[PDB]
Amino acid sequence: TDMKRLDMEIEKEKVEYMEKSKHLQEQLNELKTEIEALKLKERETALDILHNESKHNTIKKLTLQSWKSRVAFFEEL
Amino acid sequence: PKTFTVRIVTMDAEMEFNCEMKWKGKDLFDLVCRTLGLRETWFFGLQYTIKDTVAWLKMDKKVLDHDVSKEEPVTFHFLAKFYPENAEEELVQEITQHLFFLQVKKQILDEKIYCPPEASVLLASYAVQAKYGDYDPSVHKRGFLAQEELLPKRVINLYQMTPEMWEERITAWYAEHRGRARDEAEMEYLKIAQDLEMYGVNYFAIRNKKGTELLLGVDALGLHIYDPENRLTPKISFPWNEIRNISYSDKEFTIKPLDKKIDVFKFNSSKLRVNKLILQLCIGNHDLFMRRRKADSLEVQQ
């Protein structure tokens, strides 16, 4: 009873997160495009250009590589 | 006995204390935190500058035993030293949240943390809501943000936008935050900032055995290795969970895995004072991380 109630509370919270988040990503994208024509491409930084390529998402993908191979990779760099 | 004057600079303020000659870093630290009404002390530190680097007051050690310059007033910056994994879950007190907010915003405006132009606008709009409260066209009229520092310089000169155009963009988002409380605004700010790739990352120049130049990133998640041409995305990550031990001698670090049979991870760095920093931050963040995994309470490092 209370457990089904908690699950629903949890789903509510989740929905709100995803909804606020989607809206935000959408506005960020709209704004970026809306001001692009005013951009001085000559002043673009490498960080900016390297950016046009979440932090947590990329981490999990690096975290999966085994310790042995990362070490071996590190020493080969 | 005998005191010497210490100047403590916070994100907000400058104040002075009379520090006892016998005091350890923990004494002065606890005195400052109590003065601020801060209980979540584990995140913070007292930072000074020596030569090429910054240094953090060690808790166990007498303040005057530090390589800090003894010319009065001995000056420290009271600053966040360790960043939470998730600010919304871990920053319980208003004062803690507020101090991270000011600091992180300063890192955005100072360009310590890379931030795309569209994001820098969103952040500004939350900072504005935090400072001015709800938007009201009756009151916040054309030019009301004139004397404000809102966007990083890099964003500003990327575009042929005028101050009024930028103010227009910021205000437009500002109006959407209506009814957001000020502490809510600052936490929203921190929530979007913490997802930036450079957020909460301590960068250091290091080398591998071969001697190639690399960047080490020390953060709440682990140790990350970057191509020096790219601070945004590491080539490698050793998360704290895979790490058993961190040791140092003679300009070399040894990172030990959990499996004693696995080869260790080593890097080298020749700047001794910088190495102190690397060692402090590795041990500290590793400890806080392990406390989080065990759902134990956090604890003051050093």
Curated annotation (Swiss-Prot), chain B:
Name of the protein in question: Merlin
Keyword Cell membrane in annotation: yes
Effect of L28R: In vestibular schwannoma; loss of ability to interact with the CUL4A-RBX1-DDB1-VprBP/DCAF1 E3 ubiquitin-protein ligase complex
Role this protein plays: Probable regulator of the Hippo/SWH (Sav/Wts/Hpo) signaling pathway, a signaling pathway that plays a pivotal role in tumor suppression by restricting proliferation and promoting apoptosis. Along with WWC1 can synergistically induce the phosphorylation of LATS1 and LATS2 and can probably function in the regulation of the Hippo/SWH (Sav/Wts/Hpo) signaling pathway. May act as a membrane stabilizing protein. May inhibit PI3 kinase by binding to AGAP2 and impairing its stimulating activity.
Quaternary assembly: Interacts with NHERF1, HGS and AGAP2. Interacts with LAYN. Interacts with SGSM3. Interacts (via FERM domain) with MPP1. Interacts with WWC1. Interacts with the CUL4A-RBX1-DDB1-VprBP/DCAF1 E3 ubiquitin-protein ligase complex. The unphosphorylated form interacts (via FERM domain) with VPRBP/DCAF1. Interacts (via FERM domain) with NOP53; the interaction is direct. Interacts with SCHIP1; the interaction is direct.
Residues of the full protein shown: 19 to 320 of 595
GO terms of biological process kind: actin cytoskeleton organization; cell-cell junction organization; ectoderm development; hippocampus development; lens fiber cell differentiation; MAPK cascade; mesoderm formation; negative regulation of cell migration
Organism encoding this protein: Homo sapiens (Human)
Organs and tissues of expression: Widely expressed. Isoform 1 and isoform 3 are predominant. Isoform 4, isoform 5 and isoform 6 are expressed moderately. Isoform 8 is found at low frequency. Isoform 7, isoform 9 and isoform 10 are not expressed in adult tissues, with the exception of adult retina expressing isoform 10. Isoform 9 is faintly expressed in fetal brain, heart, lung, skeletal muscle and spleen. Fetal thymus expresses isoforms 1, 7, 9 and 10 at similar levels.
Disease: Schwannomatosis, vestibular: An autosomal dominant neoplasia syndrome characterized by the development of multiple benign nerve sheath tumors called schwannomas, particularly affecting the vestibular nerve. Affected individuals usually present with bilateral vestibular schwannomas but can have schwannomas on other cranial, spinal, and peripheral/cutaneous nerves. Meningiomas are common, whereas 20 to 35% of affected individuals develop intramedullary spinal cord tumors called ependymomas.
Taxonomic path: Eukaryota, Metazoa, Chordata, Craniata, Vertebrata
